[PDB]
Amino acid sequence: DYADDCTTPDGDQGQCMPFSSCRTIEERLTEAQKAGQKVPADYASYLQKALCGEFNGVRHFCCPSANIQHNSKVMSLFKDENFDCGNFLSQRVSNGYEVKLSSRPWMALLRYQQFGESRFLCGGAMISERYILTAAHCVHGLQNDLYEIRLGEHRISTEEDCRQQGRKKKCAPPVVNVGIEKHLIHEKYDARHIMHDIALLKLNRSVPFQKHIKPICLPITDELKEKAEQISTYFVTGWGTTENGSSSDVLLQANVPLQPRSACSQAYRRAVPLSQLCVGGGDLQDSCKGDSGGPLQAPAQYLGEYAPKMVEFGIVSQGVVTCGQISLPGLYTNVGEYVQWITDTMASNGLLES
């Protein structure tokens, strides 16, 4: 299967990866192409021996562990100088939870058609013109119910979301309501224990970036993956969307602390692996601001960009409850541990049409 442990024909331990996620294979293939030639016969023979299957129409090869890289077919987008992810200024500091109109333009609302009606029951965040990142618990066993995504939202109840501009008002453009072509749940998602709680939703058309709809950045470098545990305070943003729908009509945000994993391991009476982050708890109105499957976000140095960019470091997995009651620390998916899976899943499923 994709990413299974394997041994290369030359005896190195590795994982079953697409060629675009193996620095050494990609270099050999690129070097031959650049010279206007095929790879030598002995190397073609090595690749046949290294072949570990075909998953979602992509040939996979055993790649030595140290040579595994994020999928170059997707990294070319994320590293593009014109890929405008995590852009924010954004607002002047108020004590409460208010969010400036359009200031978190990646925020997504997941719509479900159930008891004859439809409701937003999860959140998520735009990561590209065709992909939304969310929790697997928002998607698993719900493929027939989960049917639309809403992007560019601020206040759910009003079709027009405006702010004062002088003696007049400036409104954000209309929201975008888009369908879902693919429900892409992590292969190792455990629905019983809630582990590897991550999923991608591929939109059924491209949603071009607009002033109020833009992607969030991902922790695509070693520095950013390492940063997840060094950040003291994160933004927990959303409409407080749970199985009971949104608790807030308007987008809100709180500054919530990263906690030691022991806080969650004690509260949930279960081991907390490195693939999870422990956040917040012990408050009445802060930890609860997030959406089920929504982002855990913070500004960071993204590649060589001058301005800090917002990066999604976590995904709301468990323990984020309704406001007004004392919360327990919340479990979040540690996004850095899944960027490899994200890039390979987006690559095999296509950035544009499938």
Ligand SMILES: *[C@@H]1O[C@H](CO[C@@H]2O[C@@H](C)[C@@H](O)[C@@H](O)[C@@H]2O)[C@@H](O[C@@H]2O[C@H](CO)[C@@H](O[C@@H]3O[C@H](CO)[C@@H](O)[C@H](O)[C@@H]3O)[C@H](O)[C@H]2NC(C)=O)[C@H](O)[C@H]1NC(C)=O
């Ligand atoms: C992208 O997806 C949208 C939204 O549709 C949703 O996602 C799709 C991938 C499918 O899973 C849909 O079942 C799901 O609703 C598509 O727009 C929607 O198209 C459908 C079907 O042509 C419309 O349904 C009809 O609605 C009428 C009017 O009430 C009924 O009479 C019909 O019997 C049927 O239910 C639906 O109204 C429409 N929704 C929106 C918001 O436009 C869109 O076609 C699709 N493709 C592209 C290229 O965007």
Ligand SMILES: *[C@@H]1O[C@H](CO)[C@@H](O)[C@H](O)[C@H]1NC(C)=O
């Ligand atoms: C959903 O509402 C019910 C009924 O009040 C409550 O028991 C529950 O905790 C809510 N779920 C979440 C995740 O907050």
Ligand SMILES: [Ca+2]
């Ligand atoms: Ca609105």
